[PDB]
Design a protein around this ligand. Structure first.
Ligand SMILES: *C(=O)CCCCCCCCCCCCCCC
Lengths: 158, 157
């Protein structure tokens, strides 16, 4: 069960938040902290909605459910799962483009700003609800890069 | 690449933004003002994208034309539908209304909240306000309940 909408409002609204946080905070980096905390709060609520509206075990499957189901169900896309770790510890999510971006732009004076940092909190918060303590973070952003990459690593069970 | 997002992406995001604003505010009235602020911050971006994409790059200079841009172009782009009603106050030549039958937020949540608010309307009103002023029409946009949720649009004399 899941109702749909166009990206416009969502990306537009998110751009509003980011643009405002840049005013309520004089430091590009304290914005990141807030965006993550905020993402965390959503991730905590999201996991529930998600779980209820569909059908993990080990970390390799979790990556699948995340990039093939979750990411597709909410943000309407499907990142690629590449660059794993010898013991199913760490992986990477690839995107031919930034999911929270389109037509809403901020004056560029923000070099240390991670525009879509909120996604990292969402992931951490969501997983943390399914008894999983992990870590998310960007390592490529469509920042003059070829593609968007989010690195994630299973830290410990709960 | 035109995308389709879950009605939840927005709902969840907006809900946090509301909480954010509420954490640094004293009253609901102030909460809505902050939301309207966030809205005004991006109204212009939406104005330019819709003009260049749906109006051959020509902005509006007449009142009726810009109001229709709001009711049709802007409302569709944001909520997938046209605004329910566009009216002029019969009492004064400088006031207009965008009347929605249901609160804007209800289309993004499984079950409408027991108690209604004007948070999405305030935010939206700020967007509509940036759109109007940035097109050359100095105005004041407010929100309230009357025949559903209303966006009051008042042009400066
Ligand atoms: C396995 O036990 C369940 C794993 C559930 C993972 C859910 C991850 C949610 C993140 C998706 C990103 C969408 C962002 C939406 C922002 C509003």
């Amino acid at each position: 069960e899941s109702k749909k909408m166009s990206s416009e409002l969502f990306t537009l609204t998110y751009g509003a938040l980011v643009t405002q946080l840049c005013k309520d905070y004089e430091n590009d980096e304290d914005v990141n902290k807030q965006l993550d905390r905020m993402g965390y709060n959503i991730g905590v609520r999201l996991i529930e909605d998600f779980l209820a509206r569909s059908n993990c075990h080990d970390f390799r499957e979790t990556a699948d459910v995340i990039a093939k189901v979750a990411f597709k169900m909410y943000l309407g896309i499907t990142p690629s799962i590449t660059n794993w770790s010898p013991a199913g510890d760490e992986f990477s999510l690839i995107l031919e483009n930034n999911p929270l971006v389109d037509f809403v732009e901020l004056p560029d004076n923000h070099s240390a700003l991670i525009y879509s940092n909120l996604l990292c909190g969402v992931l951490r918060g969501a997983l943390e609800m399914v008894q999983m303590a992990v870590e998310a973070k960007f390592v490529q952003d469509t920042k003059g890069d070829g593609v968007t990459e989010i690195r994630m690593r299973f830290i410990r069970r709960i | 690449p035109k995308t389709e997002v879950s009605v939840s992406a927005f709902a969840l995001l907006f809900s946090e933004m509301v909480q954010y604003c509420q954490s640094r505010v004293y009253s609901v009235s102030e909460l809505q003002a902050r939301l309207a602020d966030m809205g005004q911050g991006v109204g212009a971006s939406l104005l330019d994208v819709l003009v260049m994409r749906e109006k051959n790059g020509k902005r509006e200079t007449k009142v009726l034309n810009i109001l229709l841009f709001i009711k049709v172009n802007v409302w569709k782009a944001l909520f997938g539908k046209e605004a329910d009603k566009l009216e002029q106050a019969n009492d004064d030549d400088k006031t207009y209304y965008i009347i929605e039958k249901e609160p804007l937020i209800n289309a993004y949540i499984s079950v409408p909240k027991e108690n209604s608010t004007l948070n999405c309307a305030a935010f939206t009103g700020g967007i509509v306000e940036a759109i109007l002023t940035h097109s050359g029409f100095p105005a004041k946009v407010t929100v309230h309940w009357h025949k559903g949720t209303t966006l009051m649009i008042k042009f400066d004399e």
